[PDB]
Amino acid sequence: ETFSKIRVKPEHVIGVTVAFVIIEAILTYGRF
Amino acid sequence: LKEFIEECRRVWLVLKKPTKDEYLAVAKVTALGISLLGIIGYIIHVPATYIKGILK
Amino acid sequence: KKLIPILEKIPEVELPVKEITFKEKLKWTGIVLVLYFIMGCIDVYTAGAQIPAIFEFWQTITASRIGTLITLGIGPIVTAGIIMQLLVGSGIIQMDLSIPENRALFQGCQKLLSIIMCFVEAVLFVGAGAFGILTPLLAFLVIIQIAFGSIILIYLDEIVSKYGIGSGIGLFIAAGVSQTIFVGALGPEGYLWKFLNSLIQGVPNIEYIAPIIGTIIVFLMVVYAECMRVEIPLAHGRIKGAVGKYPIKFVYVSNIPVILAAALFANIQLWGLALYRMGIPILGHYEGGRAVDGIAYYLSTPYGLSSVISDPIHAIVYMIAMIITCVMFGIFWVETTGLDPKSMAKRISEKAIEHRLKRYIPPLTVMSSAFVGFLATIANFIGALGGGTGVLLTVSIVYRMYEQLLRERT
């Protein structure tokens, strides 16, 4: 087990990730 | 100092050559998987590349 | 233990509320795989469309794809592993590790060191000029992106490790290699297609099929090693005929030693290229490509098509380092994991068995590492679409995954 006092749900992680991909996809390939 | 180099020879003699039957087993299971992963990574990479470049 | 406050500070995926069906473990595995793949398709934001070729070495071990969201792939995590292993493993740090307290700290402290290395390697990466235009802002921006893509990979890793099949470090490495083999063979610039044309124009440019050959060779070879076993006799001296033999996998130490080393080596070249074009070229001197001088030189690996026969001195010294290193990490690994006699005992009166193991485990350890280390180098000498060390790790990664499908099949 671990000492971490904050547990996050798997879906959350997936989410964040998706956010990151979408935002970055925009940033870079937004130029038209 | 040399007692080690000895025990090695011991286990080195307990080396059971692979049953061609088993070899093909692991050979087909691994190769099959690499394709699974590979095919997937291709289905994504190729089209995304096509695009990034067509738009660029 | 004086880090416990910090450990509590770091987030950590929730263990599954209840058991999860293999069906799900897959779907979970699948998603992280697909996310990983998509992440390698997005470049980092850099107003300036440019990058000085690529450090043809950092990617394979790292499951990375430089110039993108996953430019540091798994580097951070592994590099972190290298450290924790050296420190604890040798003795520079005492830890029973059979008692939770220890593991908790160990495990969690690696998890922290990895999150750290994300920026460390991100800084190091940008410094080494993987990008070029060091405009303090854009530079900070990239480091940030780079670092964060890896932090994600650390967490996705955890997801597989709790809701999926195998591990993240594993998935990613394999996934990267596998994709590479396939795109570089059957992609639109596919060697395999190129070769064919030449087999229709009577001018076969071997250089188009050679690498695919290597892949095939290295493959078969690595599979073989994955089939080697040791048959422990069981001639219960009771009655005549009450004999048997319990075969066990030969690569007792497993293939972990290959990543750990290959990783350490790769790191050494990054840090070196960094300290070089910064100040003191300590670890070596690099030029239009990489280091052609220094320890960094003597830890590089020439391949990606065929067998280079220009400087065999480099090869013999490299192979020496590879083998010893593999063994070093091999030992430590066996110690820190639970493959040591001391522990094995409990599982399998005590010293009876324990002392007997102490008779054979050690030599299997060194023999295994050494073996794979050799196998690694020869794989690299041959060169192959994928990496050799890559195809190496992959073959085994894939397999161990399959096994876990069986023990999870029940």
Side-chain angles (χ1 to χ4, degrees):
Chain A
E1 57 196 300
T2 46
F3 284 169
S4 80
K5 293 291 187 172
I6 13 178
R7 304 301 213 73
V8 259
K9 313 202 70 179
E11 313 76 16
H12 189 65
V13 193
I14 302 305
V16 205
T17 298
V18 179
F20 189 58
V21 187
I22 306 296
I23 286 174
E24 222 84 30
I26 298 173
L27 276 149
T28 299
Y29 307 73
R31 319 282 182 160
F32 268 42
Chain B
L1 180 57
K2 208 101 302 175
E3 311 196 307
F4 187 70
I5 299 70
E6 166 71 310
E7 292 299 5
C8 293
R9 302 178 85 74
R10 282 285 170 277
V11 185
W12 176 43
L13 176 61
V14 191
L15 284 178
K16 177 49 59 182
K17 221 177 182 69
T19 37
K20 222 59 62 67
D21 356 319
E22 156 160 284
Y23 184 97
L24 295 191
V26 186
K28 298 153 190 171
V29 79
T30 63
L32 207 56
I34 296 186
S35 320
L36 170 46
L37 302 188
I39 290 166
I40 292 183
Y42 183 99
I43 295 182
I44 296 176
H45 181 76
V46 166
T49 318
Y50 178 56
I51 311 173
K52 305 161 65 173
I54 216 175
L55 290 181
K56 194 187 314 310
Chain C
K1 296 185 182 178
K2 311 305 188 68
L3 287 180
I4 294 183
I6 291 293
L7 309 190
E8 318 194 327
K9 257 70 178 312
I10 306 169
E12 172 143 351
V13 193
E14 307 182 320
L15 298 163
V17 174
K18 69 166 185 177
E19 297 190 61
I20 320 173
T21 155
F22 185 81
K23 301 292 160 63
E24 299 180 304
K25 294 229 191 68
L26 270 168
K27 286 185 185 184
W28 266 112
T29 289
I31 293 169
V32 185
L33 174 47
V34 174
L35 280 168
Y36 168 83
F37 275 147
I38 293 173
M39 290 186 76
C41 290
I42 305 309
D43 297 351
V44 272
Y45 171 56
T46 294
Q50 50 195 295
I51 39 75
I54 321 177
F55 319 3
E56 38 178 291
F57 69 86
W58 174 262
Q59 294 191 181
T60 350
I61 307 68
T62 315
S64 73
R65 192 138 288 117
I66 310 189
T68 70
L69 276 36
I70 58 167
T71 280
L72 283 39
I74 280 311
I77 286 188
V78 184
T79 307
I82 298 179
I83 302 160
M84 287 295 249
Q85 287 292 309
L86 288 167
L87 318 186
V88 171
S90 67
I92 307 167
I93 297 179
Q94 322 259 287
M95 280 187 87
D96 179 296
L97 298 184
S98 78
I99 293 72
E101 280 271 294
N102 302 175
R103 300 179 183 180
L105 298 185
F106 190 60
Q107 228 57 89
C109 200
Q110 208 184 83
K111 207 281 200 70
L112 190 281
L113 211 74
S114 64
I115 305 167
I116 293 178
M117 291 299 300
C118 274
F119 305 87
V120 186
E121 309 232 306
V123 166
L124 229 84
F125 237 85
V126 48
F131 304 100
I133 300 179
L134 283 92
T135 309
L137 173 72
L138 195 61
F140 173 78
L141 292 212
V142 177
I143 286 189
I144 292 306
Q145 306 179 71
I146 293 292
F148 193 55
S150 254
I151 293 182
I152 298 190
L153 235 52
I154 304 183
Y155 280 93
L156 285 191
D157 161 44
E158 289 204 351
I159 299 182
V160 187
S161 299
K162 300 177 177 176
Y163 296 61
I165 304 161
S167 66
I169 309 83
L171 221 207
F172 298 155
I173 284 186
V177 170
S178 299
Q179 177 207 254
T180 283
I181 293 174
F182 270 77
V183 167
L186 318 177
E189 300 296 2
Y191 291 152
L192 211 151
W193 292 160
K194 296 198 170 185
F195 187 69
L196 281 196
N197 177 61
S198 287
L199 266 190
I200 318 174
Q201 307 291 169
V203 195
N205 184 303
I206 323 179
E207 296 175 302
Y208 287 169
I209 222 305
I212 304 191
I213 301 180
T215 302
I216 299 171
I217 283 180
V218 170
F219 175 87
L220 285 177
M221 171 194 291
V222 167
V223 172
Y224 190 78
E226 260 284 271
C227 291
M228 292 156 73
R229 275 156 183 48
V230 165
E231 295 202 302
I232 304 172
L234 296 164
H236 268 52
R238 242 106 303 179
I239 299 72
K240 180 181 295 295
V243 179
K245 278 191 278 61
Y246 190 33
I248 70 172
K249 267 174 177 285
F250 169 43
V251 289
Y252 182 74
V253 72
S254 79
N255 251 181
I256 281 307
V258 177
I259 323 174
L260 290 169
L264 178 49
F265 279 23
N267 270 298
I268 287 176
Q269 296 148 83
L270 172 73
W271 275 85
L273 182 288
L275 299 187
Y276 161 67
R277 56 187 289 156
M278 173 206 99
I280 314 77
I282 312 166
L283 292 151
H285 289 282
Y286 313 64
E287 75 160 62
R290 55 292 206 306
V292 204
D293 156 61
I295 305 187
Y297 172 68
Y298 278 159
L299 287 184
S300 308
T301 317
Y303 83 94
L305 184 67
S306 56
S307 310
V308 177
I309 308 181
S310 65
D311 296 289
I313 9 70
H314 180 46
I316 320 170
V317 290
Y318 170 67
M319 182 171 65
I320 242 68
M322 198 60 238
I323 305 273
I324 49 170
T325 322
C326 279
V327 180
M328 174 180 82
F329 280 134
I331 303 145
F332 302 160
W333 183 254
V334 190
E335 198 52 54
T336 49
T337 299
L339 319 181
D340 69 317
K342 313 173 64 179
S343 299
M344 283 300 285
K346 294 227 69 177
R347 302 184 185 182
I348 306 181
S349 57
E350 226 63 355
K351 314 283 182 179
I353 294 194
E354 161 168 358
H355 234 294
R356 180 185 292 179
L357 303 180
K358 199 171 300 68
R359 192 178 297 146
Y360 327 84
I361 281 189
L364 233 199
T365 293
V366 179
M367 279 193 280
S368 284
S369 302
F371 179 46
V372 283
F374 176 71
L375 226 189
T377 311
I378 166 180
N380 285 170
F381 281 178
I382 308 172
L385 184 59
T389 342
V391 186
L392 195 160
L393 300 175
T394 303
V395 156
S396 70
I397 290 179
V398 185
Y399 196 52
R400 187 169 262 63
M401 277 182 83
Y402 169 60
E403 301 202 304
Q404 204 213 201
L405 173 154
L406 306 185
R407 74 194 67 288
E408 221 108 318
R409 162 55 64 181
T410 303

